[PDB]
Structure formats: structure tokens, C-alpha cells
């Protein structure tokens, strides 16, 4: 149609709030005040396509899997309510995240004040999956420990407050902070040293290795710092400068690494109540 | 800095063909569309159609179509229109006009006078 | 075709005051409204873009306002250089279409 028409446009020519990353040289859509011409150009290529679809196509997978979980038969359950409620947390949190992510990386080019609204809820949502990721996961480790349970569920809910607090601070979504918007996710995530440090101190190497714990928190712990490191040093765009606009470029392959590392965190609780209601919900030990 | 150059004042007959030059520099030329705007005496701007330097289409209004025709040189970096058929009406400035993704024109082409006498 | 109307046709103004131009569309143009000077016997100039963003260069004194279809250029503190043809125009859909065109003039 010819209505809403526009073409991509080189890095240079953009205004400075829609300046992010230089090494992304063209490709660009222009500012366009339009939310119809915003949600639109989902379908067109351009820099954000790939943003875009990773966490619009993440959101819906996530929204089906979460569906999917509350209908479980409840046979299948030691306690049904509860553990669906530790479990819908999380897919909550999940959903949160990547719907206010294809939502930022799609209104972005609308005004310097749409962008700075969504670009706060881009950040907020992240802090969201992080939390809602942390409660199944002490509700499982610290089953028959739950005064350290929830201990540890304060703990992460005040960090995670203070970092939803602080990325909605003007100067964190400038590009000189980078690395510290990375570093302030990075060790809220990381946090949970705290926790596994208690599991394996009061339960022990043996039954923390047997039960896969901690090869499964070597592998989030990579996804961690592989996502952090990949997003903060912009690689490998920095590497190949106007080859990798549209496809690989560092924010896209961190998009990637969000919804495979929320499925691999899912699979690891998704175990440990197997493992649970194979055990039963008792304290013998 | 970016400069459209266009070609000097024209007086042609009636009947004839003029052809405007439009030098591009100061930037990839085939990055943003050009545009051409007529703009008779004492009255207001009128568009008269886009084009892409990169795929070579071009949109016209369905007033000039018949009128207007908008070819280009990419390795001169140069735009032109070539107006068919003069008549007293055609006697009006016409621009090239730059795009910048969307078509709000930033740089503007000096103009040029194409003036139908008989 | 989109019909841009715009008014004043016409207004002479002393030096320091502020003055409205306003410019309305037969149909929503969402935003895609750009403004622009002309002074007699050379090019056109734009003031302002995507309805209220600025253009580089333009002074504080110009403000782009409006939704949909009604627009407005506010120009505050006018000055002996602001004198000339307004024009208005929407790139929303084609044919991009222009208005009239409001002629100041500082006194």
C-alpha cells in the first residue's frame, strides 16, 4: 500500500536517541511518529527484524508452554496449587519480559519519548525473568529448608526491585552504559552463588551433583556471562562493521540467548519436580 | 555537506521538451529517494513524484504522469526530469527535493525555471 | 488525494510576537507532517518534521504541535528573518500534498 512509506536509512543520518550501536551502519528505519507504520514495518527488513521476531515468536511459545502447564493433571503434582503457582511465576515473569521486549524493538523509532518509555519496561522486563525465574527453583532446592527459602526469595526480590529501580534512570539507557546495564543484570542473575553455595553446604557434593544441580548451574552461568559478554562487547559486529546489520549482530544473538536460556532454566525446575514427586513430599531425612 | 545543483533557466516553446539536471553530492547517492516539486508562479509547492536512485522505481502523481518522466545516471550521481509536451501551464520552478527515509525534504535543489513563450 | 487546508492566508506581525499557523488534512496523516519557510526567489527550507520535531539549524522559537488531521507552527518572539511563505506539507500518503501557504509578514 501506499500509505506510511519509508526506506532504511544509513547511521549517520539517524538522531542521536535512536543512535545505539555505530557498528550497525545501515538498515536503520527512520523516526517514524506512527505506531500503524511501527507495527507495520515488522514485516520489512531492517535492523530490529531479527530483535523483533526472536521475542514476538519467544513470547508465544512461552505463552503456550505456560497454558500448557496449568492444565497438567494434577495426579502428577505433591502439591498442585502451590506448585503451579511457583511455576506460573515464572512463565509470568517469562512472558512479562518478551512481550515488553518485541514491543520496545518495535515501537522504538516512534518518538525520543516513546522510546524512553518502553526502553524502561525493556529493562524492567528482563529483572521480571530473572525473579519469577529464581522462586520455583528455591521452593524445589530449599524443599524440607524453608526458612532459607524464603530468606532467599527476599534477598532477590529487594535486588530485583532496586534494579527495576534503577533502570529507570535516564543515563542507563545512554550507550556509554553498556557494559553497566550488563554488569547490573549480570550479577542480579549471578546472585544466586548465594543460594547454590547454602544447597551444596547443607545437602552436600554428592547429592547436588547427582541430582544434575550443578552441572545444570555451570550451563545457566555460561548462558550468563556468554550473553553479557556477547551484548556488552557488541561482538561480532565490532569485528565485521556493516556486514552483520540485519542478521547476528550482538543484541540479536542476546535475544536468541534469552528465550534458550529461559527454556534450559525451565528444563532444569521442570526435573527437580519430577525428582520431587518421585521422593514425595515428606521430611525423613 | 549535502548540494543539489540543478541546470540553469529554460525557455522553450510550445509543444517541446525540457530536460532539468539535478547534481547529487555529499552523500551515497542511491541511500535516499529524490523527489521533484513544481511550484507555478505566485502559488503553492506541488508534487510531482518520487524516485529510487537504487531500484529505479519511481511513484508519479497521476497529474504529471502523462507529463513527467524521471530517469537517472548513478554513476554521475545525477537525476533528471524530463517534462514532454510544454504548454502555457508548465511555466513554473521546478526543485529536486532529498528524502530522509520517510519523504520530509531537508535539502533542496536551487530550482529551475522552465518558461513556456511563444 | 489528501487536502491540506492552511490558515492564514495571510498576516503581518511587529517584531517580539508570537503568532499561530495552523493546517489541517481531509484525513489522518498520522504525524507525517513536515513545515517549511520559503523566502521570496529561493528554495524552500524545513522547520519542522514528523509534525513537532525540529530541524536541525531552527532556532527554540518555532514549536510544531497537532494530532490526526489538525496541525499547528507557533512561532515565538518573532524576528526581522522570519518573514516569508509558510507551507505545510503531509508525506503520510501519495500524492504528498501541500497547503496553500500563509504569508508573514514583520512590520
Known amino acids: 500500500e501506499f500509505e506510511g512509506r519509508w526506506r532504511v536509512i544509513p547511521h549517520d543520518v539517524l538522531p542521536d536517541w535512536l543512535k545505539d550501536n555505530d557498528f550497525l551502519l545501515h538498515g536503520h528505519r527512520p523516526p517514524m511518529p506512527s505506531f500503524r507504520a511501527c507495527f507495520k514495518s515488522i514485516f520489512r527488513i531492517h535492523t530490529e527484524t531479527g530483535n523483533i521476531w526472536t521475542h514476538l515468536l519467544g513470547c508465544v511459545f512461552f505463552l503456550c508452554l505456560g497454558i500448557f502447564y496449568m492444565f497438567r493433571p494434577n495426579i502428577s503434582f505433591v502439591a498442585p496449587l502451590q506448585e503451579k503457582v511457583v511455576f506460573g511465576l515464572f512463565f509470568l515473569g517469562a512472558i512479562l519480559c518478551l512481550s515488553f521486549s518485541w514491543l520496545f524493538h518495535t515501537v522504538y523509532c516512534h518518538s525520543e519519548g516513546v522510546s524512553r518509555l518502553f526502553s524502561k519496561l525493556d529493562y524492567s522486563g528482563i529483572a521480571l525473568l530473572i525473579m519469577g525465574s529464581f522462586v520455583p527453583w528455591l521452593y524445589y532446592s530449599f524443599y524440607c529448608n524453608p526458612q532459607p527459602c524464603f530468606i532467599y526469595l527476599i534477598v532477590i526480590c529487594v535486588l530485583g526491585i532496586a534494579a527495576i529501580i534503577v533502570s529507570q534512570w535516564d543515563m542507563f539507557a545512554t550507550p556509554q552504559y553498556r557494559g553497566v546495564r550488563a554488569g547490573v543484570f549480570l550479577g542480579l542473575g549471578l546472585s544466586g552463588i548465594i543460594p547454590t553455595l547454602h544447597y551444596v553446604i547443607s545437602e552436600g557434593f554428592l547429592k547436588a551433583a547427582t541430582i544434575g544441580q550443578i552441572g545444570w548451574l555451570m550451563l545457566m552461568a555460561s548462558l550468563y556471562i556468554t550473553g553479557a559478554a556477547l551484548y556488552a562487547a557488541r561482538i561480532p559486529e565490532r569485528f565485521f562493521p556493516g556486514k552483520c546489520d540485519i542478521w547476528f549482530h550482538s543484541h540479536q544473538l542476546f535475544h536468541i540467548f534469552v528465550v534458550a536460556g529461559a527454556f534450559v532454566h525451565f528444563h532444569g525446575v521442570s526435573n527437580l519436580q519430577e525428582f520431587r514427586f518421585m521422593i514425595g513430599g515428606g521430611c525423613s531425612e | 555537506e549535502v548540494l543539489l545543483q540543478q541546470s540553469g533557466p529554460e525557455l522553450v516553446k510550445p509543444g517541446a521538451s525540457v530536460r532539468i539536471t539535478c547534481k547529487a553530492s555529499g552523500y551515497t547517492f542511491t541511500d535516499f529517494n529524490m523527489d521533484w516539486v513544481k511550484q507555478s508562479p505566485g502559488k503553492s509547492l506541488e508534487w510531482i513524484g518520487d524516485?529510487?536512485?537504487?531500484?529505479?522505481?519511481?511513484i508519479y502523481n497521476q497529474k504529471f504522469k502523462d507529463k513527467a518522466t524521471f530517469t537517472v545516471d548513478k554513476s554521475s550521481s545525477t537525476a533528471y526530469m524530463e517534462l514532454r509536451s510544454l504548454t502555457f501551464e508548465d511555466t513554473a520552478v521546478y526543485y529536486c527535493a532529498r528524502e530522509t527515509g520517510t519523504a520530509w525534504f531537508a535539502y533542496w535543489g536551487q530550482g529551475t525555471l522552465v518558461t513556456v513563450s511563444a | 488525494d489528501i487536502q491540506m487546508t492552511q490558515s492564514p492566508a495571510s498576516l503581518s506581525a511587529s517584531v517580539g510576537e508570537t503568532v499561530t499557523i495552523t493546517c489541517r488534512a481531509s484525513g489522518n496523516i498520522h504525524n507525517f507532517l513536515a513545515w517549511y519557510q520559503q523566502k521570496q526567489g529561493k528554495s524552500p527550507q524545513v522547520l519542522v518534521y514528523n509534525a513537532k520535531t525540529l530541524a536541525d539549524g531552527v532556532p527554540s522559537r518555532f514549536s510544531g504541535s497537532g494530532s490526526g488531521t489538525q496541525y499547528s507552527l507557533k512561532i515565538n518572539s518573532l524576528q526581522p528573518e522570519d518573514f516569508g511563505s509558510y507551507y505545510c506539507?503531509?508525506?503520510?500518503?501519495?500524492?504528498?500534498?501541500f497547503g496553500g501557504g500563509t504569508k508573514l509578514e514583520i512590520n
Open positions: 506539507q503531509q508525506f503520510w500518503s501519495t500524492p504528498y500534498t
Open positions: 524516485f529510487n536512485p537504487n531500484s529505479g522505481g519511481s
